[PDB]
Homo-oligomer: A and B are copies of this chain.
Amino acid sequence: NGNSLSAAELTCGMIMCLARQIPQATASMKDGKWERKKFMGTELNGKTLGILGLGRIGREVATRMQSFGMKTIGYDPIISPEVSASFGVQQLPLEEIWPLCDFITVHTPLLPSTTGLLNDNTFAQCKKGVRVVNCARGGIVDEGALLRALQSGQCAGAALDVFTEEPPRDRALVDHENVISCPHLGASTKEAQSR
């Protein structure tokens, strides 16, 4: 609420980091390397962003990424489609969303219906090379399914602010070259902190 914008901002940063591998490029440069072919990236403009969860945060993400020319679709069980259309988000059933997306970001509570919202079954319906962001709650993206999708290249990259366990005790996800991460910084700004 108070911290809606901090969260939305971090999310949009993670989307741009996934498109251009800025974290990985900075580590490469700090190691004295100059690796230009390795960090060939993609443009956001024209790409499709799926926003799962269309409350305050998800709406803030949408309007920000619309300015980059991304197409914004999404799903929220409770938000009427008229409301989501007011902020430029086409609502579709989940089953319609998966194959359309270049990027998927989650802005849901952690409930049994959203634990593993992204899992092996939903990864398999995604377009090959989908990129995912979770700056919401640890466990929305099933971490084992995610590593499997990174290993096969079904998922081309992920950005995680949150983990099923914090700090994350299992490191294969975090240490993967196509994964960028933060220690649950979503609400960690001076402005969110100080009202």
Contacts and interface: CB of A to CB of B under 8 A. Distances in A.
Interface of A: 5-6, 9-10, 12-14, 16-17, 19-20, 22-30, 32-36, 39-46, 63-64, 66-69, 166-167, 171, 174-175, 180-185, 188-193
Nearest to A66: B67
A16 B18 CA distance: 12
A189 B66 contact: no
Contacts of A183: 25, 28-29, 33-36, 39
A167 B72 CA distance: 38
A190 B40 contact: yes
A93 to B, nearest CB: 28
Q: How many copies does the complex hold?
A: 2
Contacts of A25: 181-183, 185
Given A20-B9, A45-B9, A171 B36 contact: no
Nearest to A11: B16
A174 B68 CA distance: 29
12 contacts: A9-B68, A16-B17, A23-B23, A32-B171, A34-B167, A34-B183, A39-B185, A39-B188, A41-B189, A42-B191, A63-B67, A64-B68
A78 B142 CA distance: 53
Nearest to A160: B29
A180 B27 CA distance: 9
